[PDB]
Point group: D2
Chain length 386, copies 4
């Protein structure tokens, strides 16, 4: 009954089930988890792997000796469980030194420190087998207009990512980068605030083939945008390297609810798209078990992430396989949308009187699209009413 196995490629950040519940108005409600116990308990739930910030695994300020011991314990738990580490990232947001950013801090010495901190963790990520390295520029931005010249900041952001690309290629590493956009919080406005801005920025890097996006459900919804649409544009560009799954109830603070919570129909259309398009990367959950919960509630919430994905996968597959839906898709001319507008070419289009001079605009306008019948079939399938 909707039981995950490692073959489903579900992954979790250490910082997700490990969130202690400290929010802007309250103290932690849960004790800290040992990364080793998180790995074991996620493996028992059927997860495929875990992800980490450098500072989740190795406490900030650790000596190289303490560092080696933290990694060894972690690697033993991976060996004991069969868990993988497909992605890693850098914490460039918690320490006060990053209060005006890492790669785009106004202070030059902070920007250089941010790069060295990142490079050190790229080496570790490669050692643990990660294929994707995520960057979330949570402190890159501003609360006021004069604090940040955004053209200069984008120069500094391009400089940093170009240097990281030079580093991985000079080392011969087989790892790619994914930018994770967010429109705001903790900064008043964050640079590269949506999937679109991130995709555009990547095309100005020196080696664009090394960079893609890591979109998050809740972040695009914090701008009121359609998350499945943004994912479709990322897939269209060949840039969906990784994805963060969770839930969000509209335009407000970043809730990071378990996947399936928040906008349920958007979750359905997202799963439909990922499965139809053959996305084969990790299904990663960047979520926070609410601070109302004890540890039993933490693992229930994590299990719910995977359960809801598998239910939605079944409903989307039934929808697409239903002969009545296939008929309705043709009634709404989805087949015609997939056919070229003018494969006959520009001159033939210009000479085609049926395209303008003799086109019956009123008869075309009278044709209903039949979208509402199609959408109610989708609703019936989602709710198990068919």
């Amino acid at each position: 009954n909707y039981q995950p196995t490692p073959e489903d490629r579900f992954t979790f950040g250490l910082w997700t089930v490990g969130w202690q519940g400290r929010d802007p108005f309250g103290d932690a409600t849960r004790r800290a988890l040992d990364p080793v116990e998180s790995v074991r308990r996620l493996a028992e739930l059927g997860a495929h792997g875990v992800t980490f910030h450098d500072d989740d695994l190795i406490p900030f300020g650790s000596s190289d000796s303490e560092r080696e011991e933290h990694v060894k314990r972690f690697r033993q738990a991976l060996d004991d469980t069969g868990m993988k580490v497909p992605m890693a990232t850098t914490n460039l947001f918690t320490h006060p030194v990053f209060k005006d950013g890492g790669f785009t801090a106004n202070d030059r010495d902070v920007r250089r420190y941010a790069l060295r901190k990142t490079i050190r963790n790229i080496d570790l990520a490669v050692e643990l087998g990660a294929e994707t390295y995520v960057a979330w520029g949570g402190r890159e931005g501003a609360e006021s207009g004069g604090a940040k010249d955004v053209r200069d900041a984008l120069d500094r952001m391009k400089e940093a990512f170009d240097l990281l690309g030079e580093y991985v290629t000079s080392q011969g590493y087989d790892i790619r980068f994914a930018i994770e956009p967010k429109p705001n919080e903790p900064r008043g406005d964050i640079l590269l605030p949506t999937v679109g801005h991130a995709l555009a920025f990547i095309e100005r890097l020196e080696r664009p083939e090394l960079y893609g996006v890591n979109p998050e459900v809740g972040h695009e919804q914090m701008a009121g945008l359609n998350f499945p649409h943004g994912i479709a544009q990322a897939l269209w560009a060949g840039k969906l390297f990784h994805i963060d799954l969770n839930g969000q109830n509209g335009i407000k603070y970043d809730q990071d609810l378990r996947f399936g919570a928040g906008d349920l129909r958007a979750a359905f259309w997202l799963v439909d798209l990922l499965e139809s398009a053959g996305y084969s990367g990790p299904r990663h959950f960047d979520f926070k078990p609410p601070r109302t919960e004890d540890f039993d509630g933490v693992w229930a919430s994590a299990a719910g992430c995977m359960r809801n994905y598998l239910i939605l996968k079944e409903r989307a597959a039934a929808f697409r396989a239903d002969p009545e839906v296939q008929e309705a898709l043709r009634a709404s001319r989805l087949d015609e949308l997939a056919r070229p507008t003018a494969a006959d070419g520009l001159q033939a289009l210009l000479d085609d009187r049926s395209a303008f001079e003799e086109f019956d605009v009123d008869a075309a306008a009278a044709r209903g699209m039949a979208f509402e019948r199609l959408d109610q079939l989708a609703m019936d399938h989602l709710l198990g009413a068919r």
Copy 2:
């Protein structure tokens, strides 16, 4: 006292001062304006030029004979006034045939009609001297998830813009295209919903140098985004071909208030950016005089657009010229943001112990950014308190 002249390059759409006031819940409150009278009255206010949709100038369904007469009258009013036509666009949204889009309608014959309607107006735009041709895909999108396969739709959108680029190059025309993004309304979600998504899409076209963006103040604010930040990214990419100026009070329906209304401090930072960066294109107002107004209120609202730009231009110039502000910018290290992070190169950065091993993180973290004093100087200048 803040009087515009044609040298300020202020332009207006025919559809702006000509809006009759018909909204989703009410009938028109003003009679239709003759395009000739709009041109004369805008010239008297100090405007530089006007812009048009094909259907604003030539009523839909006109014979080629009626078409020639409408253009001749219009050209005589331009000659009489000295007004220019720097931009033109196509109406692919009003007629019922476009109810599921123009370039991305599911019906193939509608997509072909949309292209022919566009090409006809490009010829006219070139004849009238327009340098920019805008595309606003207001009907390209969906209210429901199954109605539109977005990857197929982006294929169709790329096909349409590639064909338009082939047409202008084969004709030898000196005109460029600008995509105008909007996140929603009238469709539930619109394709290419922000500046960022539009910039990313342009990089996949066959001749990207022919295409830029025409961002609108209110549209980015309908997604809660920072409009000056988005303009900075457009300028950074070299793609700000045109701009639509107006006002918007937050995340709601597209208000198209006069420029300076809505988010006043965003208007200040926008003018600061455009003038600092040396933007030399038209200052175009895409606004609607509220339907509460009679025709005297229409011209007062239009005059207010230009007045507010000129006041903000004066305040932003005083801000940047103030020695106390220049000192505050250095106190906040804006000078350091403009300096390369690592012009010494990757290897030197890796060997630089002052960047990591010996970096004093606590001393750097203790340095205040002094952003609040800088922002209050900006407030004082905006309000004329200094």
Copy 3:
């Protein structure tokens, strides 16, 4: 299979299935419906009744002779079908004279006209058997700060509703009033923008027992608010006289999607609440079939409204009846929320050392709320996974 009957009390506005599809950017895509054909076709779908604005039934400007004929035809269709008319309302928004409002227009003669237009339709509503008279003040508000002194406007709004209450009581009519809130559109901001503001205003009227609210799903969601929470507060106050059901995708223009579209989980919790609380008024749909649709799509969309209510009603009933859910509700202490905090009284609470001096705060804080397990049971029931 989820077939409605008149006993389910589903009702529709004439203006809903009759919407011709004219939006701010496009012309109508459907011909006008005769109110008589709408009544017949809704009765065949299983509706219980219809509602109307005065101007939906009687074209504006009709002579008393034409008026009598329009009513007679309508009443014959009601007799032929068994359809009821449980609610009626006034159009105080379409005609240009109402461009600055009806009850709160700055012009005094317009306010007097608005009252007389309303009173005439109250008489007709009573004649047709309506029990609720709705007021939606769509033009009451402002686009700018100086246009409307809101204290004076609330005086005028109270004056108008007090006069309507004096009229119905002096005539001996058995009808009550319901205010329908909306935060914005078509005005930049609308007075009494949410359920809460409307409830507060009612308490200042001379006969508060005559007035309640008619909340609409999409309108509270245009302010990002939780619609089931607002309905609970309306029920708590005894003021839920009527309700408008539809769908909305977040904070944007008023979409009026069919019920069940938009925020599906909010629709589930709404139906759970209405059925648990024993709401016995009409289940009214204030929705617009998208303008992509022809008339077959109109009736499919209307049928979908009722279908989705009945599916959600079944799932919510299964949820509440599940012994495992009843156990989970006790695990989350919903039973304790329903018990008085201090029925022993103030002095006993002050003397109770177990409430403060000897209260074990750390042991209470450690108790998990078990909300995530409860919410996944609710998800499983909604999706038919249990």
Copy 4:
């Protein structure tokens, strides 16, 4: 030059300038302030007084002996400076025991503890001379639908406030209560989310005259609402007991920017309203100096709060005193809005043929409202262009 004095009644929370900068993603960037030093430094800036949560002044868990010493030190600093304490409040949100609320926690023993913690601080507030006691129910709400039966929760909320009212009246205290609404954060949805919901709730309390609202600029703007409109409704009801001034950039997390930042024109219309209506309570700033700042930036930000109020007060006064504005207000019929619609009474209105039968609707509809000219005069005054 815009220098505050204690007569301006500017007040600050201890938690405002004392905010250490810990946000959901980062550690504190500033050391804790001693309440005594905050009082001294605010007095030097020209503040009138300070406000406090119990836990700001007395560390949680203090013995009665430590408690007495903390109060004595504080009172000496008040005596040394002349600073007043006009308002106090309870922290029912930081400690983990309040993770599901205080007054509406599902656990009954937590609700009783919350009341006793509140009552203890009411005694202290009265001893320090506070006239208003604020309640912000930041933890009262839910992330999921089944966690909280909102009707039961409102019963518990009414029970708690009724008991507090019984306590103050039985003690003979001269203090009143003010509810501070917020729509969300830290809970997914918070009960009584806007000014309107709070005003409505107060009318169901046993002694409504003891309770009013404490609205906050940023909180109403987190729902996209018009803050001056909401304040006008609060003043109209006689319930504006206190106010929280700050800034917010649209619908996102609660920014608590300094007053004047965020929506500048809303700040102008707010000051215009408060000064016109003769509001005589404290001008309280509930703001957070951004965590980018050091302590010099903290005091600059606090000074900016008061400076911006005084600049806006001067501009609003000049606006209202301008003969040209007074003429424009009459041109827009603001004088007519203040006159009764029908002081002649219902029967005279019904018999008045000029109100309907002989009303010239087309001539009334043709009258422009002249709102745009009025609003540009307001803009000119705000910017010092007149």
